[PDB]
Each structure stands twice: as C-alpha cells, then as structure tokens.
Design a protein around this ligand. Sequence first.
Ligand SMILES: Nc1ncnc2c1ncn2[C@H]1C[C@H](O)[C@@H](COP(=O)(O)O)O1
Ligand SMILES: Nc1ncnc2c1ncn2[C@H]1C[C@H](O)[C@@H](COP(=O)(O)O)O1
Lengths: 103, 103
Amino acid sequence: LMGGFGLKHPPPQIMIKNTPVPANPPTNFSAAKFASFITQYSTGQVSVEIEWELQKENSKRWNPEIQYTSNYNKSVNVDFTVDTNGVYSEPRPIGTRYLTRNL
Amino acid sequence: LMGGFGLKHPPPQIMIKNTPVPANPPTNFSAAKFASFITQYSTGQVSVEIEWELQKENSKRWNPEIQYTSNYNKSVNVDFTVDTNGVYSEPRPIGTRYLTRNL
Ligand SMILES: Nc1ncnc2c1ncn2[C@H]1C[C@H](O)[C@@H](COP(=O)(O)O)O1
Ligand SMILES: Nc1ncnc2c1ncn2[C@H]1C[C@H](O)[C@@H](COP(=O)(O)O)O1
C-alpha cells in the first residue's frame, strides 16, 4: 500500500557486522565474558545490478501525450543537482504515470 | 536554408493529368484543333511509405532533459485535434531540438 511490487520471496536481507577483536586479556583465567574490545569500524564498496523488464507503448493516440520535462526558465540552481555547498537535492517527487491508455 | 535535407537526387516529381476526351467532332473534316472537350475530373487514393533511420541518445547527463509535453490544464479544445466543426488545427510549430548534447 505504499507502492511497488508485492513479493512472497523478496530480495534477501544482507547482514554485515565487524567480528569482535578482544583487547588484552588478563593473565589469570576468568570465566567472565569480555567487555573489553578494540574499537574499530570497516568501510568498503557495494554494487547492485538489477535487470528491469519494460513494456512498450503501443498507442494509436493522435495528439501528443504529456511527458515529464524540466522547466526551461533560468534558475539559481539546477533541479536534481548539487548546490554550491555540495549537497544533492531532489526538488519534487516524480511519479511514473504520464503516458495514457484506454480502459 | 528553410530546413531539411539537401539532396542532389531528391525524390522524383510525380506528374498526373486527365487524358483529354473530345466531344462530338464535326461530320466534315477540319484541321483545326479541338477546343471541345468533355468536362471531367478524377479522384483516387495515394500512399507514401518512407523509412526513416534514427540516431539514439547515448547521453550520460544526470539531470532530466527537457521534453515536448502537452499542457495538463483543461481547455475548450484539445491541441492537434478537430474542433466542433470538424476542422483540424495545429496550435504551435514544433521543432525537433530538445535533447541536449555537449559540443
Ligand atoms: N503486486 C502484486 N504482486 C503479486 N500478485 C499480485 C499483485 N497484484 C495483484 N496480484 C495478483 C492478483 C491479480 O489478479 C493477479 C495477476 O497476476 P498476473 O501475473 O497478471 O497473471 O495477481
Ligand atoms: N544537408 C546536407 N546535404 C548534403 N551534404 C551536406 C549537407 N550538409 C553538409 N553537407 C556536406 C558538408 C559536410 O562537411 C559533409 C558531411 O558529410 P558526412 O555524411 O557527414 O560525411 O557533407
């Protein structure tokens, strides 16, 4: 009901964590659990490649259909673009429904 | 300079006319040319099939390009459509230049 594709077997969950690295243990055995860990984090790269199937417009409609277009008028910032401070921004939500079909 | 494709061998000219049909000649030979013809016209059907080759957009442009779109707002008549009296009309000229490329 928010939108999209209901799936019984959706793309799986990818889980990740940093393996614990203990700090120096005591020199006499104690069965208590370690609260002492080396503070660390990890970084890396992630790629996602999805293959989307398309359904083409077959319409016989004579007159021009609405399309999603960028405003031609000048502006301080360009839409869907970084600003002077490097911050990416999306000015408006874009739905997918423009082309028209008959019932 | 008006536009389009300069051609040294452009599509040929297709010529058509109605073959003359004389009216009743005199019964005594006269070498004068006939000014007397049966008034007639012809109608028919004509088909033109042209095969146009296309050059696709390869652009890496991030932000959305301008497109030619129909106005969403309501109106008495729809653009590029017949009116109540059956008259087809084109409200505006449409150029071909929307998509953007670099120099
Ligand atoms: N989002 C979504 N996911 C899964 N199943 C759905 C969904 N929406 C509807 N349905 C069900 C009920 C439809 O009549 C049928 C169409 O399946 P068809 O493939 O068109 O034969 O599938
Ligand atoms: N409209 C038109 N018709 C015919 N010849 C033209 C036209 N415009 C330019 N030219 C000539 C001059 C260009 O440098 C060359 C490009 O041919 P190319 O095919 O790109 O190698 O062809």
